[PDB]
């Protein structure tokens, strides 16, 4: 199935996933696409930050869902 | 400002929160949206 990840830097990332994908798996797919290290990534769905170890199915994330990507910042 | 109102809309979309809450997180983070969202998702512990 397809889900979308919207970044705050103007990209919508189109991913292929399964309900059984873990959040870590999704972050790895984002790294594949955009080069963003997983440790920087905060993935958000329906206003909540998604936790490593859970799956998309744990969060009831269905086909064509949009997730948001917020990056952790350094230097501030 | 128009620009700040747009930031509030975007913050509230990501956080799925009320506009007033978004505005205060933004203002308290110097109107820096990614910083404000980091604060929102990892508050003081
Ligand atoms: K929320
Ligand atoms: Mg497929
Ligand atoms: Mg890779």
Swiss-Prot record, chain A:
Residues 1-76 form the Ubiquitin-like domain. There is a cross-link at residue 76 (Glycyl lysine isopeptide (Gly-Lys) (interchain with K-? in acceptor proteins)). The modification Phosphoserine is found at residue 65. It is found in: Cytoplasm; Nucleus. The record marks 54, 72 as: Interacts with activating enzyme. The modification ADP-ribosylglycine is found at residue 76. There is a cross-link at residues 6, 11, 27, 29, 33, 48, 63 (Glycyl lysine isopeptide (Lys-Gly) (interchain with G-Cter in ubiquitin)). The record marks 68 as: Essential for function. Phosphorylated at Ser-65 by PINK1 during mitophagy. Phosphorylated ubiquitin specifically binds and activates parkin (PRKN), triggering mitophagy. Phosphorylation does not affect E1-mediated E2 charging of ubiquitin but affects discharging of E2 enzymes to form polyubiquitin chains. It also affects deubiquitination by deubiquitinase enzymes such as USP30. Exists either covalently attached to another protein, or free (unanchored). When covalently bound, it is conjugated to target proteins via an isopeptide bond either as a monomer (monoubiquitin), a polymer linked via different Lys residues of the ubiquitin (polyubiquitin chains) or a linear polymer linked via the initiator Met of the ubiquitin (linear polyubiquitin chains). This is Ubiquitin.
From Swiss-Prot, chain B:
This is Tyrosyl-DNA phosphodiesterase 2. It is linked to Spinocerebellar ataxia, autosomal recessive, 23: A form of spinocerebellar ataxia, a clinically and genetically heterogeneous group of cerebellar disorders due to degeneration of the cerebellum with variable involvement of the brainstem and spinal cord. SCAR23 patients manifest epilepsy, intellectual disability, and gait ataxia. Ubiquitinated by TRAF6. Belongs to the CCR4/nocturin family. Transmembrane segments: none annotated. It comes from the Eukaryota. Widely expressed. Highly expressed in various brain regions, including the frontal and occipital lobes, the hippocampus, the striatum and the cerebellum. DNA repair enzyme that can remove a variety of covalent adducts from DNA through hydrolysis of a 5'-phosphodiester bond, giving rise to DNA with a free 5' phosphate. Catalyzes the hydrolysis of dead-end complexes between DNA and the topoisomerase 2 (TOP2) active site tyrosine residue. The 5'-tyrosyl DNA phosphodiesterase activity can enable the repair of TOP2-induced DNA double-strand breaks/DSBs without the need for nuclease activity, creating a 'clean' DSB with 5'-phosphate termini that are ready for ligation. (Microbial infection) Used by picornaviruses to remove the small polypeptide, VPg (virus Protein genome-linked, the primer for viral RNA synthesis), from the genomic RNA of the virus. Acts as a 5'-tyrosyl RNA phosphodiesterase and cleaves the covalent VPg-Tyr-RNA bond. This cleavage would play a role in viral replication and occur in viral replication vesicles, but would not act on viral mRNA. The chain holds residues 25 to 66 of 362 of the full protein. It is found in: Nucleus; Nucleus, PML body; Nucleus, Nucleolus; Cytoplasm. Interacts with TRAF2, TRAF3, TRAF5, TRAF6, TNFRSF8/CD30, TNFRSF5/CD40, TNFRSF1B/TNF-R75, ETS1, ETS2, FLI1, SMAD3 and ACVR1B/ALK4. (Microbial infection) Interacts with Hantaan hantavirus nucleoprotein.
